[PDB]
Amino acid sequence: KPHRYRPGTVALREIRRYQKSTELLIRKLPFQRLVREIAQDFKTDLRFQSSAVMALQEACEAYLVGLFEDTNLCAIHAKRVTIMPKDIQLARRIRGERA
Amino acid sequence: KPHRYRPGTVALREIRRYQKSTELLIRKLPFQRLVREIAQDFKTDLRFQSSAVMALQEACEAYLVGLFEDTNLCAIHAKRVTIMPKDIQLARRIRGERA
Amino acid sequence: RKRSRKESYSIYVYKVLKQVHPDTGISSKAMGIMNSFVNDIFERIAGEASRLAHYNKRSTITSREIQTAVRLLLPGELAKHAVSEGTKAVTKYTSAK
Amino acid sequence: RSRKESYSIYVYKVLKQVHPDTGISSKAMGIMNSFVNDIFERIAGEASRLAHYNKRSTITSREIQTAVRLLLPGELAKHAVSEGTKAVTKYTSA
Amino acid sequence: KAKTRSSRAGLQFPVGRVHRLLRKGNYSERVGAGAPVYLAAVLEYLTAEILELAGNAARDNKKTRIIPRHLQLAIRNDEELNKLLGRVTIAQGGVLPNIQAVLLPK
Amino acid sequence: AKTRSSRAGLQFPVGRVHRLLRKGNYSERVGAGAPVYLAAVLEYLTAEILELAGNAARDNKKTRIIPRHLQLAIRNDEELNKLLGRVTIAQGGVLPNIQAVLLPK
Amino acid sequence: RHRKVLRDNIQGITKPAIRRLARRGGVKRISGLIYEETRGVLKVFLENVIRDAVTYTEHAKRKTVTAMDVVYALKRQGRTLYGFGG
Amino acid sequence: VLRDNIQGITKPAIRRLARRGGVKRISGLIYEETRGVLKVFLENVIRDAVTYTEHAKRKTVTAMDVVYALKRQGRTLYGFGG
DNA sequence: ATCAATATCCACCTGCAGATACTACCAAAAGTGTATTTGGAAACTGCTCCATCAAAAGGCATGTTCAGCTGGAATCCAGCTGAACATGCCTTTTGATGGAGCAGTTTCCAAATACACTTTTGGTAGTATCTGCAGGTGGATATTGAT
DNA sequence: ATCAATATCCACCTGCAGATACTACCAAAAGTGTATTTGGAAACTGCTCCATCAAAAGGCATGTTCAGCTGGATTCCAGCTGAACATGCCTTTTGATGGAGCAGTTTCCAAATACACTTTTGGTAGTATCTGCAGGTGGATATTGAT
Ligand SMILES: [Mn+2]
Ligand SMILES: [Mn+2]
Ligand SMILES: [Mn+2]
Ligand SMILES: [Mn+2]
Ligand SMILES: [Mn+2]
Ligand SMILES: [Mn+2]
Ligand SMILES: [Mn+2]
Ligand SMILES: [Mn+2]
Ligand SMILES: [Mn+2]
Ligand SMILES: [Mn+2]
Ligand SMILES: [Mn+2]
Ligand SMILES: [Mn+2]
Ligand SMILES: [Mn+2]
Ligand SMILES: [Mn+2]
């Protein structure tokens, strides 16, 4: 009796939903901690303008979304609908990020 | 029975042979004809230094060879050993040369 | 103490906006995008003109370098329309004084 | 006529230091020339941006050094920075 | 009474400022008087082109104020602007709706 | 009269590097040490490539470095290969490399 | 005083955050190993940009990374960003 | 015979380029696909080279014209000047 | 097909963040005018090297046959991954506060540019000798593929 | 396993193209020295905004259950593409030969820089008032999935 959408229906609903909006998808405070942690390992006692953190998050999300598009094409090329580590790796190799 | 190598054996021999060498693989004069024809569509009555045509053939062969490597990775990704149009197209799309 | 002047293209972007879409506004973040865009293209054209002069042993960037830089940098139709607007502005400018 | 400057005699000088019994063909010399010109441009260009970003009108060895760090991968940068500092120290003490 | 170089060229974009930016930018030893006129005009024109398409996207979304999203739709839906800005990221621009056909249900 | 190069311990021409920085329109002013530092970096990078390329020549039983040797030296070196990742060496060819899945049996 | 030690913050890039990004990228179905793969790729990307940004900060003799430090770092890696002072 | 110039880029030559690219097996449709790709590459580079020629008020495309064009296209080439 | 559960649409609303408006103010920007300097266009010309020609010669492209083996279609199923749920943590939001450090102003000298003059050197052009290695040989042996 | 057909490799040899060593000539370039100028470090410090704290709350992460349907494995076979070989077409060679036009030199003027002075303007700041649209609600329409 309880209602269930079929597997994939909600996933497509989610694609439409996030492709329509522009808001950042990674939580703000956890992203900022990651930035501070990495920076601190390069150089202690750094401070960050808040806009510097936002510019990193905008760039990071744009990179990843763009990477997932390429990854998706690699999966589909192999006649799959499911993206795997090897799709990401082929995308990065052809991009020349690890060529 | 007369002698025959299995399909693929001679292909692998050729790979080893051309990866060993550095000579240009397109014939010079037909390449030269192609270049002058394309350039004629931008500006008529042009002349070329001989080194200009050679620089174009070096760049063009290096580009195609590099492209064939990426194309080959795309075929292998889809569990084939035969490169196809869709492999070239995927490689060029992920490189950002198109689509 | 006075915090020094930060120049931008905002009032000019805004004027051009009112020419093409008289009743359309623009947010400050969109204006930030537009300002980045103009600086970006400025530098790309100026850089290409710089190289072009240097390649030809010229010490002067004239409207001719700008024009060739525009043709190298912009795709098809944009280049055509930019070139005509550029040429028109220069001929109008010299026809005066 | 005219003169065409290149880095050929200095590349060759360095070749004899590292491999005294090794020669180099003219085509390979051309490649070395392209290499040196390319890296010159990359470093000068980055140093140029650095000075401009910081509202400075002068490119000093400090701009060349930050540029080297930005452009060269890890170990190449370390050794280049070392060689750079070494040459500026020695030049100063003379 | 003094006319601005912009008015003299028939331009909205600032010729004087563009000329000053060319000189301070160390692009060359000298800058001809036509150079910043031509450059200011090209920049103006590209600005016009983007604002035209961005205001249409705003209108298409029933908005009167252009936001970065409208700038991104305008750029990515226009083949030539997409090419010119192909390695550019527009903050808060998002992406074009686009679902690969093979992913749709049968 | 003693050259700035000899003064700095370099084979690469300091005076020329200085003149190229000025004429290049990189900035209004060039400090004295900048061409010295830059000349040193270029000499060192040149030394590193010729070292590896000479080795490549000797490994191919040759005594004269040709373009092929420069390519072998650069592509086999992780850092040089990265620095020159978007560069084409004329007459260099490619590294021997066959994907394992294409090997017989 | 000093702040608590920072560690393991890559895990703050959660599985649903990564799923959301994949959805914006048009992805319908996602293997279980994608999440750790994505974290590694993100960390490399962040490290590279932050490394260049901090290098700009230091050259300016500042102790505060600015938005322009980031913009300049993104520019030189061919990830030009509009909207933060370009 | 009256053949196009792009058709003078032969199947065996394309085969050899693929072999240097590590390719073992080739679909019959690859050859036309490659010619189209080759032509777009040449058009893109030659257009820029000729734009440098014209700017210099020359009638001769030089090696440096080609080298500058390859560089701005992100295909930097060593060995022909610059 | 019917029908039910749920998402999606759109109209309507209200709060407010953020856009707009206006005056005051001012340093820098921009323009006008005059004097002085010079980049590079223009015309002419020498000499590099590009186009074209003939003219074999053989290397290599093309067409054809035959079949090995690859790509793709079809079929099965184990279990990965998506959907839905319960639970409750920790991000978000709001606001305040100390004070790090960025940035603004002014001072001042080490190091820059600018010439003039002198010395050196890299690029050059002939001219002559030299040599690393491509390409050809033979003959050993490794590889491949048929039994 | 054997065995034959080719490919591949090693040693050696020799012609020559391209590398070397030589003298000599010379403009440009690099060094040296002096006089002048100024960029930007140092000092001081105003004032933005960054780190951090608190405190409440609900949006959203986490962890689990369940089973739909995906990916991976297997089998199969039609037909495409590799290998081999017979032709003969056209690329390659090279060597000479006009002559286009690149590039060097000289001339000289429109247009550049430099500078003094005056006017204009865009940026900031200070408050004070509109206004587009985010986000909430409710109810009608659309979509999906079971039967
Ligand atoms: Mn740490
Ligand atoms: Mn002159
Ligand atoms: Mn059969
Ligand atoms: Mn198969
Ligand atoms: Mn303090
Ligand atoms: Mn000499
Ligand atoms: Mn041999
Ligand atoms: Mn000063
Ligand atoms: Mn929980
Ligand atoms: Mn089951
Ligand atoms: Mn399936
Ligand atoms: Mn003539
Ligand atoms: Mn005003
Ligand atoms: Mn709404």
Author numbering:
A (entry chain E), B (entry chain A): 37 to 135
C (entry chain D): 29 to 125
D (entry chain H): 31 to 124
E (entry chain C): 13 to 118
F (entry chain G): 14 to 118
G (entry chain F): 17 to 102
H (entry chain B): 21 to 102
Quoted passage from the original study:
The nucleosome core particle (NCP) is formed by wrapping the histone octamer, comprising two copies of the four core histones H2A, H2B, H3 and H4, with the superhelices of a 145–147 bp DNA duplex. The core regions of the four core histones adopt histone folds, which mainly contribute to the formation of the histone octamer structure. In contrast, the N-terminal tails of the core histones, which are rich in positively-charged lysine and arginine residues, protrude through the DNA superhelices. Furthermore, the N-terminal tail of H4 is crucial for the compact folding into chromatin fibers.
In addition, although the crystal structures of unmodified NCPs are known, we prepared the unmodified NCP by a similar method, and crystallized it in order to compare the structures between the H4-tetra-acetylated and unmodified NCPs in detail, under controlled experimental conditions for sample preparation and crystallization. We overexpressed the unmodified H4 protein in E. coli, and used it for the subsequent crystal structure analysis. The crystal structures of the H4-tetra-acetylated and unmodified NCPs were refined at 2.4 Å  and 2.2 Å resolutions, respectively, by molecular replacement as described in the Materials and Methods. Overall, the two NCP structures were nearly identical, as demonstrated by superimposition. In the H4-tetra-acetylated NCP structure, the electron density corresponding to the residues from S1 to K20 of H4 (molecule B) is missing, which is quite consistent with the previous structural analysis. The main chains from V21 to I26 and the side chains from R23 to I26 are visible in one of the H4 molecules (molecule B) of the H4-tetra-acetylated NCP. In the unmodified NCP, these features are almost completely the same: residues S1–K20 are disordered, and residues V21–I26 are visible in the molecule-B H4. As for the other H4 molecule (molecule F), residues S1–A15 and S1–K16 are disordered and residues K16ac–I26 and R17–I26 are visible in the H4-tetra-acetylated and unmodified NCPs, respectively. In particular, the position of R23 in molecule F and its hydrogen bonds to E56 of H2A and E110 of H2B, in the acidic patch of the neighboring NCP, are conserved between the H4-tetra-acetylated and unmodified NCPs. The averaged B-factors from the three independently refined structures of the H4-tetra-acetylated and unmodified NCPs were plotted along the nucleotide sequence.
